[PDB]
Amino acid sequence: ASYTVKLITPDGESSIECSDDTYILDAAEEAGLELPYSCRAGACSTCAGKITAGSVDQSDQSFLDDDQIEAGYVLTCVAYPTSDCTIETHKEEDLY
Amino acid sequence: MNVGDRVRVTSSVVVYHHPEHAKTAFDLQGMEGEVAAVLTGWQGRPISANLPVLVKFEQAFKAHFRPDEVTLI
Amino acid sequence: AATLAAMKNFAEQYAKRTDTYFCSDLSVTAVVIEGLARHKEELGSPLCPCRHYEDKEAEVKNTFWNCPCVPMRERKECHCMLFLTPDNDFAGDAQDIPMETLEEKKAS
């Protein structure tokens, strides 16, 4: 059970195949991408992203609040793809 | 203390990241698990972690410990 | 510095999420955020500033000391005194810090 994660980074687009049991960030690193991170536990915003399309399971995160969660921001280090999705990386700035 | 050994939390250790005790203090003493890692180096290079013994417990929950905090079995 | 604002915005939100508070002497707080931002601008990860390492490139990869570090996430133990429990003696009742108070630290 794997999904297609269309990552939109500053350097452009790049689609990867992430398993339903694999974190977006981890899957992205397996494809050879260079995504930002810090705690790798979902307690900060360094890996912050934004889901334009699709859905993800980031129940393990704890930094982002409701308002931010509803906006579409996600912590790629603890996010599981719940279906085919499109995520924008390097979005910490747009967070606050 | 090698990767794989099943340790037991003998010392009192309070945490706040437990899935069933989020943001609230909870003592792990009495819990048993296995050493998932012994942080000391990263691909040869030296690491400076003061809570090396990483132990994974029931389901999705792990925690770092100081050697004297855990006991071999 | 743009990175500075990001580290400031983080610290402020994190303190509120973890119910922690900044030191009753914001000067200490500003100094940590200044270090975090610096490290982040260099390595890419806000590596704990109030410490000495023999290989910062590796530390960042191990992540143990990437703010918020393991001791802080697991035991709310912030060695830099950045994040404190309301219980803490050095604790103050502020979770926000004036950008100006930070800029004045960069001037050193």
Ligand code: SF4
């Ligand atoms: S001790 Fe940990 S929580 Fe405190 S400033 Fe350093 S990395 Fe951040």
Ligand code: FES
């Ligand atoms: S690395 Fe800190 S929330 Fe993902």
